[PDB]
Design a protein around this nucleic acid. Structure first.
Ligand code: K
Ligand code: K
Ligand code: K
Ligand code: K
Ligand code: K
Ligand code: K
Ligand code: MG
Ligand code: MG
Ligand code: MG
Ligand code: MG
Ligand code: MG
Ligand code: MG
Ligand code: MG
Ligand code: MG
Ligand code: MG
Ligand code: MG
Ligand code: MG
Ligand code: MG
Ligand code: MG
Ligand code: MG
Ligand code: MG
Ligand code: MG
Ligand code: MG
Ligand code: MG
Lengths: 62, 181, 48, 129, 260, 140
RNA sequence: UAGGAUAGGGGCCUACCAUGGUGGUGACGGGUGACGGAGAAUUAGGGUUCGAUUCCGGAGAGGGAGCCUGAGAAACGGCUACCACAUCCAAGGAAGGCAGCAGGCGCGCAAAUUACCCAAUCCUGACACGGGGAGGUAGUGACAAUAAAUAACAAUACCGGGGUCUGGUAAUUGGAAUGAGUACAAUCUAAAUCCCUUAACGAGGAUCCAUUGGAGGGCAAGUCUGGUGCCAGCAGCCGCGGUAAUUCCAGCUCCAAUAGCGUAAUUUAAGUUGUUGCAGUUAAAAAGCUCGUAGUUGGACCUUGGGCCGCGACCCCGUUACUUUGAAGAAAUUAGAGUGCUCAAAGCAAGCCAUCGCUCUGGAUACAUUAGCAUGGGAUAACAUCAUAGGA
């Protein structure tokens, strides 16, 4: 309040492989080290139920 | 369950039992005008805080001077009253805590102390100055006029560095006027 | 009884418009005005 | 019948003190009344008292000095812990500066201040101030 | 309910965990293991809330799945593993070893220990009796069974266990005059010597303990843990040395520290 | 006198239990007859305007109070509800929704109006105060 | 008593046997708009009322009943049947259970989006990875709660008061100030959004316009003006209204609270339920009188003095209440220690000259009836005895 100063948290990884293994995906996406896969959770749920109604390899075609 | 349901909250004031008593209305208005209060609730909450402090002090006075709770909690209460400027140095007893009035608490507001420090021409000018973000306590600007100022923070009440009265740039009114000129 | 006279007087009363007056300060300033009037200056509404 | 001899003793003393009498006779006598009278005498609220042996329940003749405002019993003898002494004194005593509540404790019959000094609770006999 | 509870509501968590009220709806329910759920400190708490190595649940999982944490010499990957009193927590990458002891306020504190001192724990004997084949066996309050114990060892004894070899290297008989630490109740974390043992038939047994400065306290037998033969404990103690302080003396210490 | 013995707790408690029924407020609360009232323990009730009526005031006063006869919807009970605010009877029509409330004395009749403990507060979803002050209009 | 059954005790069930068991210290029955508790409101003390709801315990999944699987279910987002509803049908059948989340009818005085997400907390699986309407995020949301704008200053003019000095007044006259709002951007965030921060913009009748109730008394404020005229209406109560209405309908003015305020069970007020603490001659209230069981209440009496050392001590196989101390009595709530979320309601954080780190950082303590366990005390009191002591 009143400006002039800010506080936050910072991590510095010793190497890029450590970061890609320990860092949460959203922060990597923020830093450009990963891509945001655009999905709808609800659509996944509906497709999962519809496919659970089916048996075999024909599940993928439903 | 919602975790937010566990956050505590409480009321800061009570309304008077008798709403239309001349003497009480006059006394409240006198205090409000003397300290530039926005309504009676600002004085009622100060009375509420004084009531809780007084009740605590009275309850330790009704205990032995060797009761380890009275030694501990009375020391804490005296520390809190000396910290906020409500008690002098000679007044180093729980008895003097019972003698405190709402005037003592109202005198420690940032509005009152800004007015008495010479930074403002009136108590109301002090109120607007604080609400306009021109006042900082230490390095922290305070826009809350009911701010209770400690004695260690009294000498650090100063104009904000971002304010036109504290070395900052001119406000939008002045700048617009010079741009017109 | 007879319900025909419901609204008699309020319908008979001639309509008088409210004067467009200045607003009074609102909040702390209003308390300042009241404090000045009754502390630095017959009842408050005496017909003098 | 006589249910509490202490009540009769204290009420007779109170009536005599109000009447301005300088001597009051107590009958029957009992160890609790002599123990209450000793507390009273120790705090200076009465003078000499004399136990008269009649080969029965005795008699006590007490000198009165005009310093009594009231003495009475509490019936029943409610159990009073050390922590409830404050509430009892607020209920029965004129001020926190004067007055005494008499307790019967396993450490003896004593006033409430002395009960606090030894941290002993008990039962309330009465009061005087 | 129709079976075991899998969730611990955060309000219902042990108070010595010092979990905050608004951190979530849930607390880590300790897994079954050597110590009781209400008397343990789970590994996730040690790693995230105490040592600050991890910042989240998932980060605790990442640390533990790297096999970086050994509890009493053995790698644990369960986050809710119930680490308890006298347990050795070692991280053989930073080279640090911790003994889970109690501070005088009843809260588990990670006490740094030397490499040699991390080679043993102290266990309290729960019972001695004959197992199958008539073989004598010992069991402790931290879930260990030791066969062929020393016949001089009885119930309520404290045995010194070498984690490397998994044998009793020494033991202490529960006697009057031995320094003890209270592990349960309001005197948890208090250290003193036993002055007398008051026994009552058919009910719990009361132990009278007096600390070094002379304060006397009493607690049940199930809450007493012998830590040394005589007045010298076998392990190192936290900074308080088991000497509980009244709030007045704590305020005195705070005032002195602020004045300095 | 009254019983004072240390062992007479039951006597005192039973006597207080029996004597509390003499107090009118206690017996009104704990008899269960308030569930047989038209409102059945609720602050407000809705009802149908059956017919507009005018009932005379008490003896000292001379006025026609112009109440309304309302059939409640929750239980079908017919009540008489007063219509305050001069001229508000014209906002009341037969077969029109009204929200009734208590007349302020807890089922006791109020003022010079005999036998009326209910007032009309809202008609057709619009408060009577708004219609009096012309802040809103009654829907058609 | 002996079996059977059960994971195991047990009339849990069976066979035989006996006649018991509970009850004015209220059994049994009835009512509850009764889930219990932690707790909540109000409280000088004592108390009164509430406790569906996020923590603990219990119970149910339309109503009953019965089961399979399984370590764990008499499971219902498992099955079987009946009752009640009810869906699709090609009439042959088939499928059911929102008191999960959202949403919809209905009921009502009375209560939100058919949103996003596993990033947090944590749980679960073969599992570091999947999943989670748990849970979180946003939306609606004057339930409730916290802080806090709607102006400040100066000069003229007036009124003043104390010519001068100093005060209050004006849609006067002036420049200052600023956030409501808008918005670059950054920050926020799982992604967004809000907040915090901040360019540019953003006040004069600063229309960037505060309301809700009142003005006879209770009870603060008008015996101003117009209208109505026992009508209309107001009025919690007392009352007002019939031509001069301090009360109705209005205008003006004033008053209270104020971003709030009005209206329609419970606490206080109520010492009008009274244990503390009320009454009973005449206001309501001593049975017509006496006996009498239970209950309640019960006279006095028993190791005291004394000194010494030194407030402790010294010397000359009956109970219980009561009291003292200790251990327990979840957390949250309450009280309370610390701590400048800008204040505050909060939260359980944080602080340190700036530190590749440190302060073992903190994350106290008190309260907690009754009943239970243990320690000391024996004055008071209760019960049991208490001249075959026939004692040793
Ligand atoms: K169960
Ligand atoms: K069985
Ligand atoms: K049997
Ligand atoms: K299974
Ligand atoms: K998650
Ligand atoms: K997982
Ligand atoms: Mg059997
Ligand atoms: Mg029910
Ligand atoms: Mg409940
Ligand atoms: Mg219900
Ligand atoms: Mg609900
Ligand atoms: Mg539950
Ligand atoms: Mg079930
Ligand atoms: Mg249903
Ligand atoms: Mg079922
Ligand atoms: Mg379902
Ligand atoms: Mg289920
Ligand atoms: Mg405005
Ligand atoms: Mg008045
Ligand atoms: Mg008027
Ligand atoms: Mg009376
Ligand atoms: Mg008569
Ligand atoms: Mg009479
Ligand atoms: Mg006696």
């Amino acid at each position: 309040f009143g400006g002039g100063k800010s506080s936050g948290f910072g991590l510095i990884y010793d190497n890029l492989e450590s970061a890609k293994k320990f860092e949460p995906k959203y922060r990597l996406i923020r830093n450009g080290l990963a891509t945001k896969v655009e999905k709808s959770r609800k659509q996944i749920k509906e497709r999962k139920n519809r496919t659970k109604k089916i048996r075999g390899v024909k599940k993928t075609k439903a | 369950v919602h975790v937010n349901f566990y956050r505590n909250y409480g009321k800061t004031f009570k309304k008077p039992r008798r709403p239309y008593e001349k003497e009480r209305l006059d006394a409240e208005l006198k205090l409000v005008g003397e300290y530039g209060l926005r309504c009676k609730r600002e004085l009622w909450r100060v009375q509420y805080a004084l009531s809780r402090i007084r009740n605590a002090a009275r309850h330790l006075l009704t205990l032995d001077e060797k009761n380890p709770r009275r030694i501990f909690e009375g020391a804490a209460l005296l520390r809190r009253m000396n910290r906020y400027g409500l008690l002098a140095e000679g007044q180093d007893k729980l008895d003097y805590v019972l003698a405190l009035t709402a005037e003592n608490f109202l005198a420690r507001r940032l509005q009152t102390l800004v007015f008495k420090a010479g930074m403002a021409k009136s108590i109301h000018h002090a109120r607007v100055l604080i609400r306009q973000r021109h006042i900082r306590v230490g390095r922290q600007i305070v826009n809350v006029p009911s701010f209770m100022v400690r004695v260690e923070s009294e000498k650090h009440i100063d104009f904000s560095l971002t304010s036109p009265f504290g070395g900052g740039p001119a406000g939008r009114v002045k700048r617009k006027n010079q741009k017109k000129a | 009884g007879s319900l025909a006279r419901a609204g008699k007087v309020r319908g008979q009363t001639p309509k008088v418009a409210k004067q467009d007056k200045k607003k009074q300060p609102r909040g702390r300033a209003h308390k300042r005005i009241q404090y000045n009037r009754r502390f630095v200056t017959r009842g408050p509404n005496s017909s003098e | 019948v006589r249910v509490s001899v202490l009540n009769d003793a204290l009420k007779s003393m109170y009536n005599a003190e109000k009447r301005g009498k300088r001597q009051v006779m107590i009958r029957p006598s009992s160890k609790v009344i002599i123990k209450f009278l000793i507390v009273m005498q120790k705090h200076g609220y009465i003078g000499e008292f004399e136990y008269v042996d009649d080969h029965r329940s005795g008699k006590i003749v007490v000198e009165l000095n005009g310093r009594l405002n009231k003495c009475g019993v509490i019936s029943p003898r409610f159990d009073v812990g050390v922590k409830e002494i404050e509430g009892w004194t607020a209920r029965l005593l004129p001020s926190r500066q004067f007055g005494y509540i008499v307790l019967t404790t396993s450490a003896g019959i004593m006033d409430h201040e002395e009960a606090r000094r030894k941290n002993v609770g008990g039962k309330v006999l009465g009061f005087f101030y | 309910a129709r079976g075991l509870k899998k969730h611990l509501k955060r309000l219902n968590a042990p108070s010595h965990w010092m979990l905050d009220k608004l951190g979530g709806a849930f607390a880590p329910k300790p897994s079954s293991g050597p110590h009781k759920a209400r008397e343990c400190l789970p590994l996730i708490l040690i790693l995230r809330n105490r040592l600050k190595y991890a910042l989240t649940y998932r980060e605790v999982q990442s640390i533990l799945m790297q096999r970086h944490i050994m509890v009493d010499g053995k790698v644990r990957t369960d986050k809710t593993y119930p680490a308890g009193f006298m347990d050795i927590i070692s991280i053989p990458k930073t080279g640090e070893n911790y003994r889970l002891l109690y501070d005088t306020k009843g809260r588990f504190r990670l006490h740094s220990v030397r490499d040699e001192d991390a080679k043993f724990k102290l266990c309290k004997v729960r019972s001695v009796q004959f197992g199958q084949k008539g073989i004598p066996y010992l069991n402790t309050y931290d879930g260990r069974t030791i066969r062929y114990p020393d016949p001089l060892i009885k119930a309520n004894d404290t045995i010194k266990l070498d984690l490397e070899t998994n044998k009793i290297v020494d033991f202490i008989k529960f006697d009057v005059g031995n320094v003890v630490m209270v592990t349960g109740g309001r005197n948890t974390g208090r250290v003193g010597v036993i002055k007398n043992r008051e026994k009552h038939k058919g009910t719990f047994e009361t132990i009278h303990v007096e600390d070094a400065q002379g304060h006397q306290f009493a607690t049940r037998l199930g809450n007493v843990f012998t830590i040394g033969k005589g007045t010298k404990p076998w392990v190192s103690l936290p900074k308080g040395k088991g000497i509980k302080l009244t709030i007045i003396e704590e305020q005195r210490k705070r005032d002195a520290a602020a004045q300095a | 006198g009254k019983t004072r013995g240390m062992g007479a707790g039951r006597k005192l408690k039973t006597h207080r239990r029996n004597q509390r029924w003499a107090d009118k407020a206690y017996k009104k609360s704990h008899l269960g007859n308030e569930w047989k009232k038209p409102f059945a323990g609720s602050s407000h009730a809705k009802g149908i305007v059956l017919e507009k009526i005018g009932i005379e005031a008490k003896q000292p006063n001379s006025a026609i109070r112009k109440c309304a006869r309302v059939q409640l919807v929750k239980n079908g009970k017919k009540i008489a509800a007063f219509v305050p605010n001069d001229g508000c009877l014209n906002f009341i029509e037969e077969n029109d929704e009204v929200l009734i409330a208590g007349f302020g004395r807890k089922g006791h009749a109020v003022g010079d109006i005999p036998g009326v403990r209910f007032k009309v507060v809202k008609v057709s979803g619009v408060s009577l105060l708004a219609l009096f002050k012309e802040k809103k209009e009654k829907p058609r």
